[PDB]
Amino acid sequence: NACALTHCGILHKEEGRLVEAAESYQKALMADASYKPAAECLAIVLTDLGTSLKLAGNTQEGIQKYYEALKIDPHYAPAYYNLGVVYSEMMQYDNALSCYEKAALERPMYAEAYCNMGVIYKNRGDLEMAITCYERCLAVSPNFEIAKNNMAIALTDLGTKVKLEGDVTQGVAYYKKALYYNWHYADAMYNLGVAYGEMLKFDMAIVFYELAFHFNPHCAEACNNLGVLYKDRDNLDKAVECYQMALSIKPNFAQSLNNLGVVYTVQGKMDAAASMIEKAILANPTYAEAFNNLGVLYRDAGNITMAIDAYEECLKIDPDSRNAGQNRLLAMNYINEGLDDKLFEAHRDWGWRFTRLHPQYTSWDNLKDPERPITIGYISPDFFTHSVSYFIEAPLTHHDYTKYKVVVYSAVVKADAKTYRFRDKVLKKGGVWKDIYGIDEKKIASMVREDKIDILVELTGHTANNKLGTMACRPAPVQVTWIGYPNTTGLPTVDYRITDSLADPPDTKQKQVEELVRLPDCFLCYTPSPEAGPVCPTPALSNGFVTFGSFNNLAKITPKVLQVWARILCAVPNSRLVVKCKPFCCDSIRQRFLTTLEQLGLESKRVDLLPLILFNHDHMQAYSLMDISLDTFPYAGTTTTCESLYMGVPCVTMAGSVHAHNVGVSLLTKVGLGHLVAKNEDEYVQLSVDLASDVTALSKLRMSLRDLMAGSPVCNGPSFAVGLESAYRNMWKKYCK
Amino acid sequence: DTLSYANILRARNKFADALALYEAMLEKDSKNVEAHIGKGICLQTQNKGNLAFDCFSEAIRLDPHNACALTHCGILHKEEGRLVEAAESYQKALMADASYKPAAECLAIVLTDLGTSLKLAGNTQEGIQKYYEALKIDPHYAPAYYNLGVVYSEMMQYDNALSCYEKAALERPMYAEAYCNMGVIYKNRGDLEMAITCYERCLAVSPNFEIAKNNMAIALTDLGTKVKLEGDVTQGVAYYKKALYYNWHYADAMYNLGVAYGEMLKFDMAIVFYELAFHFNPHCAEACNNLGVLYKDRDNLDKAVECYQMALSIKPNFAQSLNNLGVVYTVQGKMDAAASMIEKAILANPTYAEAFNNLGVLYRDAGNITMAIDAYEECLKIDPDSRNAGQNRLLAMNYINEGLDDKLFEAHRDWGWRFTRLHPQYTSWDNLKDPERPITIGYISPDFFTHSVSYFIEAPLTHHDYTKYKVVVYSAVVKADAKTYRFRDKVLKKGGVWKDIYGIDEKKIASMVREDKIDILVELTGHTANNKLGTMACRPAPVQVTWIGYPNTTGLPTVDYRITDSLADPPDTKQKQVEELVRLPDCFLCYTPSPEAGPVCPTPALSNGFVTFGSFNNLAKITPKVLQVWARILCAVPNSRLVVKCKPFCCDSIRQRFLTTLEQLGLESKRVDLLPLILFNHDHMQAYSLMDISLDTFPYAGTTTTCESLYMGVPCVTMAGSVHAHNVGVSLLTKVGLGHLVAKNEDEYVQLSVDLASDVTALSKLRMSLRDLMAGSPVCNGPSFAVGLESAYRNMWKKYCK
């Protein structure tokens, strides 16, 4: 009785007696081989046995039982599925794929076969077809979770692949589809975020990153990116918070280490910045930007030599690093006195390389008429409350706008009342302001060409955010540099340079690539600020001793200056020095500086280190706290000396062999105080002691300084303007020939 | 020189040395008030509160007059929490010196603190006056103005609040809280522009002040909703995203983005944003509702049910979710649960018209025709232009309207007039009025799949002289299948011009049909579901014909002719219709047998020893009036068994109701086998082995069911009546040659049924020979039917040309 045997086999299977069920089905099929139900039940029992053996570790017995089942019933899709699974466990990926294909040909509702084939194929990287397999799976069953998750993963991988080839839009589309299949997928959100960041969306980049972090609190990359976006929005506190979270998750994420170091540098917390950057170097030796940031941190912190060394390693890692090279040259300007031709050669080599990777123009449509109206463009990122602004203000106001059309290219990152006032003055005379912050160098060159300027004046040189890349294009028929840098730009593309006969004597030995154009009178036209207040009386009259001071930065105070100041203060009993500068907000810097002076035998008590109290009026009045300003070398001050003079504190400087050194000589002699210019360190000491010995002469000098200078040419805007215009006309006439 | 040197030394961050000098001065200079003051200040700055208090007390004892000493005493009192004492010292100092500034500002501070204390005590007027006194001693003190603004705001003096916060903002521009509160007040007045501006100022001062960010996000979301309501959806989305910038987890902004993208048809993004909105605000039931709608429209019914169950778990009386869940259950066939859902939706909201429409359709499927009709009339009371409600209402009335008056015709006429007054039409055609050139025949219908209409339209589709009547098919089929594709091949292999028109519009379709130069437009659908009567409302074709899609008048004056025969619609029929009836010589239907019908088998009664009646008609046709007649039949015939097969029986509720009805009518359920809808065509066809005699329904006769019965050799008993739908069976049976099986009344019907039941043997023989008899009859005479239909086309076209 085939029916009774089949029912017995089914009952045995229901009781878990798979062997007895198989035996009963075999007997039934021996009695009637056409009894389809008996064959089906036997195949079922054989598949159950095979699955038990597979899970029991009897892989070979499982395979054998599956082959027997598939020989008994070909149409039994589950046997094909189990065979494919076993072959996958056997790493027979092609055999597994074939088994799943057969199973899908047999079972029309076996979506798991599509899922597993898609997974296996994904493991070999043929993403698109596997995705098609998942599409078939979800077309059969649209709620199968595991398949949705694999669909999202595969779509994210494909979107990343396609984006890396440059089709950002298709990558974004794949990420959005992935989020359609799995909304809480951190990788999709993160990738989408970076994609938006690339296409300058910012807003949604931030939103996406925050969501990605919310759904996966282990994506330090998301935190770091978010911190970067907030930093670029000037929300420094949020940026710090984000980076701190990133480091709390990954205490070695080198990129976040550098970024946090930079933000601390902006806030001026120098010791923490140093520690973070050093940790970044410890974590990454190839991360050039870490070396550049370390070099800037050393530069402002005064450890100059170490700054040059750090930039040198940076250029060993990335020889094209623009920032590393320019900061290196700027730092060298602080200590390389005129002796050798190493700074000059460095400038020449750097300019030649910059010209090699940056081609320039070769023709100009400027009508070569020596007498027609000349268009002068002044370019600078420093038309804000910055040292340079204290001088360029003079030409902005005292210039003829009838034949010298002035156009200003202000790259100021943050305007202010002074920015607005400057634009107002320039435009009121007929100027065409042009805000260029963020604009690509090449586009700036094109814009300059379109406006058809004649004399292009670069005002920053190798300082932060410089625009020498625009100058390399040679957009204007004549390019000059003036105030932003006291040495050669090194660019052969600049035609001439403006100077005076005192900063650069006709016999100067400092080699430079540029031809010096010496103005008749002084080349510095300091515009006194109206917030200077009254000339405070000589402190010596009320205190009873001379107080030296120096309102310069740390980069300019080379150890040699420290030796000279220690000699001065030891040689003059009862005399105090009150240096003031921004980095003295850090206690560690104060301690190190005090110890450094102590090794020179000077009692720290006499010194009065002060931070950069951000108070314009109070900054001006602070010269009421000192009696004699002592200039630094080999990088003498320019605005600082002007401030000293205008507040009645006499400044003593030293002459030297390079423009950067002799700027103070030029200024002091041209203000008619050349008798306070020492020629050497010994004469410097003698002058300092002599000035310190006569408090009454000091009082007379202070009370005379404001009116003498106000009547002196340094403040005679009209005459300086006439000289400058004549110089411009002369260079233009030379060019016409 | 000593006092000057001490003061300079104290100013030069040399507090220890200055303190030592002050000590040696109070020692040497026993009554040196200035030295006592210097010592007090240097110790206070050294956090020597006790010593500072001692020095200040000694200074006051020596000089009770100098304003500086009293100022230092007052500040120390404030640091010690002696607000009162500080205040008295301050008044004394003011009386001593009115020019001192530090005392003035610190005095403003202490009095504003006092005013705040009194305000907290409820002494609002005393606080206000104290603040005014402070501002009189120092107008520049912004915090006093801020306090005034707060008190006036809580005091509902909003204009005064603005004035106060503006005086504060002038006196202190970096006072973020003033901007925040100003923005909040403007938010309260409905104006969101200036409010956003105030929040922008606040964030321009302090971007980390989160409270202003949240309030800004709220304001931007409201602004986005407003702008969207104005029409500009892109700007709305822009505002929503800018909002979601300030509060990345603001769930409501995500929900509104979901809505905005849904309107844009970017459904995938809509899903993402609705799911996120729900994730951040579980209480946002509306997000679940709309998510369920989107998933339902993607045919993912299980997820739609899940989403609606969540919406109802949040708001059980959320009418929209109740209605949509009811519809989803309707598609799945959970008829009783659907009924309960829709009824609860109505109970929660009585004006939700579409719920009334869905209730009416559900009851019509359940056979309660009266209640379905009633629900449709209620719907039309709530919404009178509900096109679907009207369509279902007329269709439902066709199931129980026994021809006894002209009210149905009146309703159809008025409804068609409504359509003609809410639709325009053309008046000229360039089609050459010629009776010899090949005419263009359009068949338009959504039923070109496994539907009743197909089983009849297939025959002409197979037999159309293509050299004369160029066939154009306008298919509104929604879901195709193997049969649909097979039909496509059949139409496209004989030179037909197929045109898929599903899912676009009515007006544009009519215009395209006119471009197609269709000569006669034929509707095959009637007032059923997915009809396209709106196209004909435009009158796109010069000739309009309705073949079977509707068994009664369409009521549209725009339809010229309705195809019928002289038996279903006798020439003397009294039912008026707007259309002209065209009677074909033979039965107006040509049944195309299924190529899967298979063979016939031995009569069941022969093997079981008892006669089995049956009805495969849907429950909608089995009105409560036929049930009594059927009970009479089964009682009159000893040992008979009734098999009824209708879809809605899958639900136990309807089954039980039907059984109860039969039991109260005098019949034991044990004789009644109720079978639900079977799965595949084959088994449905084979189910005819379960019945011996088909019993036709009235006043709506079967059409496909009757044809199938005659095919498979199961005789059907029908009766003639006053309406076409009743006489369809009469026409069919007469034209097959079984006119002796046509009853004229209920009693003749009973007698005929008994007569057929009395002779099992002859019944079996007839059953055997019926397939060949009918196959030889005109109902299967494709050539003759085609020729007659061609003649009909020629006659109508010639009539039109003249």
- DSSP string over B438-477: PEEEEEEES--SSSTTHHHHHHHHHS--TTTEEEEEEE--
| Contact (Cβ atoms closer than 8 angstroms) between residue A79 and residue A87 | no
Three-state secondary-structure class, residue A376: strand
For residue B302, list chain A residues with Cβ-Cβ distance below 8 A.
Answer: 143
d(CA B637, CA B756): 10
How far is the alpha carbon of B281 from chain A, nearest alpha carbon, in Å?
15
d(CA A222, CA A543): 59
For residue A207, list chain B residues with Cβ-Cβ distance below 8 A.
Answer: 241, 244-245, 248
Order of strands, sheet of A677-678, starting from the edge strand that comes earlier in the sequence: A575-579, A546-550, A628-630, A651-654, A677-678
Checking chain A for breaks where C and the next N are over 2.5 Å apart, the residues before them are none
Alpha-carbon torsion, ordered B133, B136, B139, B144, to 10 deg: 0
B275: closest chain A residue by CA: A183
How far is the alpha carbon of A425 from chain B, nearest alpha carbon, in Å?
27
Interchain pair A143, B303: CB under 8 A = yes
| Contact (Cβ atoms closer than 8 angstroms) between residue B713 and residue B633 | no
How far is the alpha carbon of A204 from chain B, nearest alpha carbon, in Å?
7
Say whether the peptide bond before residue B699 is cis (omega within 30 degrees of 0).
Answer: yes
Q: Which residues of B622-661 are buried (b: 16+ CB within 10 A; e: fewer)?
A: bbeebeebbbbbbeebeebbbbbbbebbebeebbeebeee
Residues of A with CB under 8 A from a CB of B: 142-143, 176-177, 179-180, 183-184, 203-204, 206-207, 210-211, 214, 235, 237-238, 542-543, 608
Looking at the fold, whether A121 and A247 belong to one and the same domain comes out as no
Q: How many domains does chain A have?
A: 4
Which token pair is A155?
């779509």
Three-state secondary-structure class, residue A499: strand
Looking up tokens 């975020």 gives: A193
Interchain pair A183, B241: CB under 8 A = no
- Residue B55 CB contacts under 8 Å (≥ 6 apart), including other chains: B36, B37, B39, B40, B43
B247: closest chain A residue by CA: A207
Looking at the fold, whether A147 and A201 belong to one and the same domain comes out as no
Residues forming beta bridges with residue A377, ordered by sequence position: A407, A456
| Contact (Cβ atoms closer than 8 angstroms) between residue A301 and residue A294 | no
Handedness of CA B368, B373, B378, B383 (dihedral sign): positive
Nearest CB partner across the interface for A180, out of B241, B249, B268: B268
Interchain pair B241, A204: CB under 8 A = yes
Nearest CB partner across the interface for A183, out of B242, B272, B298: B272
Looking at the fold, whether B612 and B543 belong to one and the same domain comes out as no
- Residue B526 CB contacts under 8 Å (≥ 6 apart), including other chains: B395, B546, B548, B549, B550, B551, B554
Looking up tokens 């005192």 gives: A502
Q: Which of B268, B278, B299 to mutate to test the interface with A (most CBs of A within 10 A)?
A: B268
Q: Say if B511 falls within a structural domain.
A: yes
Looking at the fold, whether B618 and B758 belong to one and the same domain comes out as yes
d(CA A669, CA A659): 15
For residue A176, list chain B residues with Cβ-Cβ distance below 8 A.
Answer: 268-269, 272
Q: Say if A525 falls within a structural domain.
A: no
For residue A235, list chain B residues with Cβ-Cβ distance below 8 A.
Answer: 207-208
Looking at the fold, whether A443 and A564 belong to one and the same domain comes out as no
The candidate with the shortest Cα–Cα distance to A524, out of A734, A334, A665, A733, is A665
| Contact (Cβ atoms closer than 8 angstroms) between residue B539 and residue B426 | yes
d(CA A327, CA A307): 9
| Contact (Cβ atoms closer than 8 angstroms) between residue B36 and residue B26 | yes
Residue type, A668: L
| Contact (Cβ atoms closer than 8 angstroms) between residue B46 and residue B15 | yes
d(CA B102, CA A376): 53
For residue A542, list chain B residues with Cβ-Cβ distance below 8 A.
Answer: 4, 8
DSSP element (H, E) containing B365: helix B353-365
d(CA A193, CA A205): 4
How far is the alpha carbon of B246 from chain A, nearest alpha carbon, in Å?
9
Looking at the fold, whether A413 and A289 belong to one and the same domain comes out as no
d(CA A547, CA A627): 5
Q: What is the DSSP letter of B721?
A: -
Domain end: B173, B189, B212, which one?
B173
Q: Which of A183, A206, A230, A547 to mutate to test the interface with B (most CBs of B within 10 A)?
A: A183
d(CA A694, CA A685): 15
State the Rg of chain A over Cα: 39
Nearest CB partner across the interface for A207, out of B12, B248, B300: B248
| Contact (Cβ atoms closer than 8 angstroms) between residue A404 and residue A426 | no
Residue A470 — left, alpha, or beta (φ > 0 → left; ψ -120 to 50 → alpha)? alpha
Looking at the fold, whether B58 and B147 belong to one and the same domain comes out as yes
| Contact (Cβ atoms closer than 8 angstroms) between residue B525 and residue B506 | no
- Residue A217 CB contacts under 8 Å (≥ 6 apart), including other chains: A249
In angstroms, what is the resolution?
3.9
| Contact (Cβ atoms closer than 8 angstroms) between residue A627 and residue A654 | no
d(CA B149, CA B170): 14
How far is the alpha carbon of A176 from chain B, nearest alpha carbon, in Å?
7
d(CA B296, CA B299): 5
How far is the alpha carbon of B272 from chain A, nearest alpha carbon, in Å?
6
| Cβ neighbours around B393 below 10 Å, total | 25
Q: Which residues of B449-484 are buried (b: 16+ CB within 10 A; e: fewer)?
A: bebebbbbbbbbbebbeeeebbbbbbbbbeeeeebe
For residue B241, list chain A residues with Cβ-Cβ distance below 8 A.
Answer: 203-204, 207
Residue type, B147: N
Residues of B with CB under 8 A from a CB of A: 4-5, 8, 12, 207-208, 241-242, 244-245, 248-249, 268-269, 271-272, 275-276, 279, 298, 300, 302-303
The candidate with the shortest Cα–Cα distance to B395, out of B714, B13, B700, B784, is B700
Handedness of CA B392, B394, B397, B399 (dihedral sign): negative
Q: Which of B216, B237, B248, B295 to mutate to test the interface with A (most CBs of A within 10 A)?
A: B248
Looking at the fold, whether B82 and B46 belong to one and the same domain comes out as yes
Q: Say if A346 falls within a structural domain.
A: yes
Residues found in chain B: 802
Give CA angle at B21 (B15, B25), nearest 5°: 140
For residue A214, list chain B residues with Cβ-Cβ distance below 8 A.
Answer: 248-249
How far is the alpha carbon of B216 from chain A, nearest alpha carbon, in Å?
15
| Contact (Cβ atoms closer than 8 angstroms) between residue A426 and residue A478 | no
Three-state secondary-structure class, residue A527: coil
The candidate with the shortest Cα–Cα distance to B392, out of B353, B428, B345, B358, is B358
| Cβ neighbours around B251 below 10 Å, total | 19
DSSP element (H, E) containing A406: strand A404-410
Q: Say if B780 falls within a structural domain.
A: no
DSSP element (H, E) containing B742: strand B742-743
For residue A237, list chain B residues with Cβ-Cβ distance below 8 A.
Answer: 208
Order of strands, sheet of A515-519, starting from the edge strand that comes earlier in the sequence: A434-435, A404-410, A374-380, A455-458, A478-481, A496-500, A515-519
Looking up tokens 């959320």 gives: B318
d(CA B410, CA B416): 10
Q: Say if B247 falls within a structural domain.
A: no
For residue A203, list chain B residues with Cβ-Cβ distance below 8 A.
Answer: 241-242, 245
Interchain pair A543, B208: CB under 8 A = no
B9: closest chain A residue by CA: A543
Interchain pair B242, A214: CB under 8 A = no
d(CA A245, CA A227): 9
Q: A165-169: long-range contacts at Cβ-Cβ below 8 A with a sequence spacing of 24 or more?
A: A168/A195, A168/A198, A168/A199
For residue B246, list chain A residues with Cβ-Cβ distance below 8 A.
Answer: none
For residue B268, list chain A residues with Cβ-Cβ distance below 8 A.
Answer: 176-177, 180
Interchain pair B248, A211: CB under 8 A = yes
d(CA B669, CA B664): 10
Looking at the fold, whether A20 and A123 belong to one and the same domain comes out as yes
Range of the domain at A257: 192-357
How many whole angstroms from its chain centre is CA A57?
Answer: 59
Interchain pair A142, B279: CB under 8 A = no
> In sequence order, what E strands does B311-387 have?
none
The CA–CA distances, whole Å, from A638 to A387, A388, A389, A436, A565 equal 8, 9, 12, 27, 20
| Contact (Cβ atoms closer than 8 angstroms) between residue B355 and residue B319 | yes
Looking at the fold, whether A396 and A486 belong to one and the same domain comes out as yes
d(CA A470, CA A478): 13
Interchain pair B272, A177: CB under 8 A = no
Q: B296-299: long-range contacts at Cβ-Cβ below 8 A with a sequence spacing of 24 or more?
A: B296/B324, B296/B327, B296/B328, B297/B267, B298/A142, B298/B267
d(CA B707, CA B593): 9
The candidate with the shortest Cα–Cα distance to B178, out of B142, B217, B222, B152, is B142
Handedness of CA A445, A448, A452, A455 (dihedral sign): negative
Which token pair is B594?
């299924």
| Cβ neighbours around A309 below 10 Å, total | 16
Domain end: B141, B173, B205, which one?
B173
Which token pair is A66?
């599956």
Alpha-carbon torsion, ordered A566, A571, A572, A578, to 10 deg: 0
Looking at the fold, whether B570 and B614 belong to one and the same domain comes out as no
Residue A613 — left, alpha, or beta (φ > 0 → left; ψ -120 to 50 → alpha)? beta
| Contact (Cβ atoms closer than 8 angstroms) between residue B622 and residue B642 | no
d(CA A716, CA A521): 11
How many whole angstroms from its chain centre is CA A692?
Answer: 47
Strand A455-458 and strand A478-481: the pairing is parallel
Interchain pair A207, B242: CB under 8 A = no
Q: Say if B487 falls within a structural domain.
A: yes
Interchain pair A183, B303: CB under 8 A = no
| Contact (Cβ atoms closer than 8 angstroms) between residue A623 and residue A647 | yes
Say whether the peptide bond before residue A650 is cis (omega within 30 degrees of 0).
Answer: no
Looking up tokens 């450094």 gives: A596
d(CA B108, CA B138): 7
> In sequence order, what E strands does A430-522 have?
434-435, 455-458, 478-481, 496-500, 515-519
Looking at the fold, whether A26 and A153 belong to one and the same domain comes out as yes
CATH number for the domain spanning A153: value is 1.25.40.10
Taking the alpha carbons at both ends of chain B, their separation in whole angstroms is 133
How far is the alpha carbon of A537 from chain B, nearest alpha carbon, in Å?
14
The structure's method of determination equals cryo-EM
DSSP element (H, E) containing A82: helix A77-89
d(CA B323, CA B347): 11
| Contact (Cβ atoms closer than 8 angstroms) between residue B563 and residue B524 | no
- Residue A59 CB contacts under 8 Å (≥ 6 apart), including other chains: A53, A86, A89, A90
How many whole angstroms from its chain centre is CA B73?
Answer: 74
Q: What is the DSSP letter of A504?
A: S
State the Rg of chain B over Cα: 45
A230: closest chain B residue by CA: B207
Q: How many CA atoms lie within 13 A of A410 on its CB side?
A: 27
Handedness of CA B432, B436, B440, B445 (dihedral sign): positive
Interchain pair B272, A176: CB under 8 A = yes
Interchain pair B272, A204: CB under 8 A = no
Query: Any alpha helices (H) in A498-615, and if so which ranges?
Result: 539-542, 559-571, 587-599
Q: Say if B792 falls within a structural domain.
A: no
Q: What is the DSSP letter of A583?
A: G
How many whole angstroms from its chain centre is CA A573?
Answer: 48
CB pairs under 8 A between A and B: 47
CATH number for the domain spanning B660: value is 3.40.50.2000
How many whole angstroms from its chain centre is CA A578?
Answer: 34
The CA–CA distances, whole Å, from B733 to B418, B567, B709 equal 38, 10, 11
d(CA B779, CA B732): 8
Phi, psi of B217 (to 5 degrees): -60, -45
Nearest CB partner across the interface for B269, out of A176, A210, A542: A176
For residue B300, list chain A residues with Cβ-Cβ distance below 8 A.
Answer: 142-143
d(CA B652, CA B650): 6
- Cβ burial, residue B745 (10 Å; 0-12/13-18/19+): exposed
Nearest CB partner across the interface for A177, out of B207, B242, B268: B268
| Cβ neighbours around B5 below 10 Å, total | 15
Q: Say if A348 falls within a structural domain.
A: yes
